Design an enzyme around this catalytic site. Structure first.
Site, mmCIF file in Angstrom:
data_model
loop_
_atom_site.group_PDB
_atom_site.id
_atom_site.type_symbol
_atom_site.label_atom_id
_atom_site.label_comp_id
_atom_site.label_asym_id
_atom_site.label_seq_id
_atom_site.Cartn_x
_atom_site.Cartn_y
_atom_site.Cartn_z
ATOM 1 N N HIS B 41 22.934 44.647 47.002
ATOM 2 C CA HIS B 41 22.199 43.835 46.022
ATOM 3 C C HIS B 41 23.111 42.915 45.181
ATOM 4 O O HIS B 41 22.597 42.129 44.387
ATOM 5 C CB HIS B 41 21.249 44.657 45.136
ATOM 6 C CG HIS B 41 21.903 45.569 44.142
ATOM 7 N ND1 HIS B 41 22.501 45.081 42.994
ATOM 8 C CD2 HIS B 41 21.916 46.918 44.099
ATOM 9 C CE1 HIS B 41 22.906 46.149 42.320
ATOM 10 N NE2 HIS B 41 22.576 47.274 42.946
ATOM 11 N N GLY B 143 26.216 47.065 35.155
ATOM 12 C CA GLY B 143 27.563 46.818 35.658
ATOM 13 C C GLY B 143 28.200 48.036 36.309
ATOM 14 O O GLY B 143 29.285 47.938 36.890
ATOM 15 N N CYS B 145 26.941 49.586 38.884
ATOM 16 C CA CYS B 145 26.614 49.604 40.311
ATOM 17 C C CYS B 145 27.876 49.527 41.152
ATOM 18 O O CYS B 145 28.811 48.816 40.783
ATOM 19 C CB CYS B 145 25.640 48.484 40.649
ATOM 20 S SG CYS B 145 24.049 48.639 39.812
HETATM 21 O O1 LIG Z 1 19.137 49.098 38.300
HETATM 22 C C1 LIG Z 1 20.021 48.241 38.234
HETATM 23 C C2 LIG Z 1 19.923 46.935 38.999
HETATM 24 C C3 LIG Z 1 18.894 46.989 40.105
HETATM 25 C C4 LIG Z 1 19.227 47.492 41.357
HETATM 26 C C5 LIG Z 1 18.251 47.699 42.321
HETATM 27 C C6 LIG Z 1 16.932 47.381 42.053
HETATM 28 C C7 LIG Z 1 16.594 46.838 40.829
HETATM 29 C C8 LIG Z 1 17.571 46.637 39.862
HETATM 30 N N1 LIG Z 1 21.149 48.379 37.495
HETATM 31 C C9 LIG Z 1 21.576 49.512 36.768
HETATM 32 C C10 LIG Z 1 22.193 50.620 37.351
HETATM 33 N N2 LIG Z 1 22.566 51.729 36.695
HETATM 34 C C11 LIG Z 1 22.322 51.782 35.393
HETATM 35 C C12 LIG Z 1 21.701 50.742 34.655
HETATM 36 C C13 LIG Z 1 21.450 50.820 33.262
HETATM 37 C C14 LIG Z 1 20.879 49.772 32.599
HETATM 38 C C15 LIG Z 1 20.533 48.610 33.276
HETATM 39 C C16 LIG Z 1 20.743 48.500 34.622
HETATM 40 C C17 LIG Z 1 21.328 49.562 35.360
#
Ligand SMILES: O=C(Cc1ccccc1)Nc1cncc2ccccc12
Ligand SMILES: O=C(Cc1ccccc1)Nc1cncc2ccccc12
Ligand SMILES: [Cl-]
Ligand SMILES: [Cl-]
Lengths: 305, 305
Positions: B41, B143, B145
């Site tokens: 992604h 961030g 990811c």
């Molecule tokens: O979910 C996503 C992106 C994404 C990826 C896949 C599908 C939709 C959206 N990112 C994040 C991963 N971890 C913790 C997070 C904490 C706060 C904000 C975003 C976070």
């Protein structure tokens, strides 16, 4: 989202762990520049530990009596000296993996990461706090002596603890890296006990703010308290006194959540007098005190090293 | 003595963390040999996330569209391919800090260490379990990811998880290092929800045996149970079914403590019925399920107290 007991990345410390052998006793050493630091009790037999005269035991040792192993490489000891309860072994090779470091002495309530080691090899990393009674509730087995406690500030490792012993209650005692024990402990096989412990109040408050940041608000209330009335209630439940310095350090978290520090103190008062009533805070049924205000901010902002 | 939630030393993984940038998006990558693995992604915009056609978004990219930074050194991308939900960026430099490693897909209930990272820089390390609903209760901000989950049994790092997303309840979803998601999740911003979570029964039992090894027996009782009667009771508390495999896995701990697995199951039944009555087990007021039988054997002494 999420809130975990988080240790600092241990890589900078892993590159410093060595095995120190003296006679039958093997333990861990911290190799920084051309010096290996380890507990001075490495020179003791089980009989010597009963009543050791470290200066006398040490004077009978030569450099070649200390075997230092860094991975599968033997380091030659070219000098040895004692500083308080730490033995300093001068070696011929400066550790090429020596990070930027400082030796810092921490205060009770401050937290640090412990890289538990056996035979100079790191086995695990965990976070813990220096209890108000100067012990740490660590997880250590035989051979873990010489394992170290540290924090990271930017790219600088601040070494704050070296493991020396386990007390009869299963809690641990150690020194700073200058060999000064934390607490009224001595490195000798004799009757020693941890004092009655107290809860680190400023840390519980920090963790309550972390719970609010993560969406747990059930414990909040419309009430506030004076610092003095809160401390009367804290003294009653074996909680450490909360100082104006603690209130100041909680300022950022108070501004971020919109909950004044004395407003959060009234929630804590209510939790101490009434309990959690079957509820949890951040997945815990007990009030957690091993996260400092700084740990909470660092984890709820993503600071890197 | 002592029992802590302990992570593996993160050094071997820290030396693999890199920053991956594709356009405006920046996340973490795992640099092993001459390949950088990261969530696919990274090629998406926030818009694209509802229904991304990864094959179509990827075909429009060239090697020079991916900026990979290892510390303060830019790595040149010489190839790119997608394997399930992971993007594999072939780079012109093999990572000199590549440890001995394997990619392992874990089952629910298994534990692992998470090295949380932001901008290719490690910020913290914690211990996790893959929940029965295939999510992890991590601590991740935007961030994070590309941060990875791993175990280090001996000198080999087994990479088992790569972080991809946060679900609406604050729990996290991700993939093994071959890009296959754990659970019925997809790397899409579509309405997705974690299934009802349950307690990892075999892990709670392992932790009860850790408590017995560390000297605590208050929760034991004179009773035993059939595996079927235990499962009928345990499912009523949202506990995972205990299988004959779990009973077999608990054999070594049963032999060490002298407490049969079904006798320990009767203690667990009683604990679920009664609660802890103001008592703790290994410093916890809740039954802990993020220590496997293998974690308990690794951390606890081979001699019971
Ligand atoms: O979910 C996503 C992106 C994404 C990826 C896949 C599908 C939709 C959206 N990112 C994040 C991963 N971890 C913790 C997070 C904490 C706060 C904000 C975003 C976070
Ligand atoms: O207490 C000492 C040594 C010592 C040091 C000072 C005075 C007497 C004895 N070492 C240990 C430290 N941690 C965990 C242990 C678990 C089992 C056995 C020993 C352990
Ligand atoms: Cl002396
Ligand atoms: Cl980086």
């Amino acid at each position: 989202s999420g809130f975990r007991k988080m240790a600092f990345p241990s890589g900078k410390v892993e590159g410093c762990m060595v095995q120190v052998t003296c006679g039958t006793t093997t333990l861990n050493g911290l190799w920084l520049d051309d010096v290996v630091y380890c507990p001075r009790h490495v020179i003791c037999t089980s009989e010597d530990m009963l009543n050791p005269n470290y200066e006398d035991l040490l004077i009978r040792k030569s450099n070649h009596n200390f075997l230092v192993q860094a991975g599968n490489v033997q380091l030659r000891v070219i000098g040895h000296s004692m500083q308080n309860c730490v033995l300093k072994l001068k070696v011929d090779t400066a550790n090429p993996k020596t990070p930027k470091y400082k030796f810092v002495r921490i205060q009770p309530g401050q937290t640090f990461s412990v890289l538990a080691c056996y035979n100079g090899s790191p086995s695990g990393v965990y976070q813990c706090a220096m209890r108000p009674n100067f012990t740490i509730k660590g997880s250590f087995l035989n051979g873990s002596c010489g394992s170290v406690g540290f924090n990271i500030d930017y790219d600088c490792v601040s070494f704050c603890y070296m493991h020396h012993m386990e007390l009869p209650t299963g809690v641990h005692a150690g020194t700073d890296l200058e060999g000064n024990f934390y607490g009224p402990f001595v490195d000798r096989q004799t009757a020693q006990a941890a004092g009655t412990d107290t809860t680190i109040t400023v840390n519980v408050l920090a963790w309550l703010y972390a719970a609010v940041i993560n969406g747990d608000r059930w414990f909040l209330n419309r009430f506030t308290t004076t610092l003095n009335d809160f401390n009367l209630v804290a003294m009653k439940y074996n909680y450490e006194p909360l100082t104006q310095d603690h209130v100041d350090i909680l300022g950022p978290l108070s501004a971020q959540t919109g909950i004044a520090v004395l407003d959060m103190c009234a929630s804590l008062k209510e939790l101490l007098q009434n309990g959690m009533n079957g509820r949890t805070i951040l997945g815990s049924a007990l009030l957690e005190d091993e996260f400092t205000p700084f740990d909470v901010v660092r984890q709820c902002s993503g600071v890197t090293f």
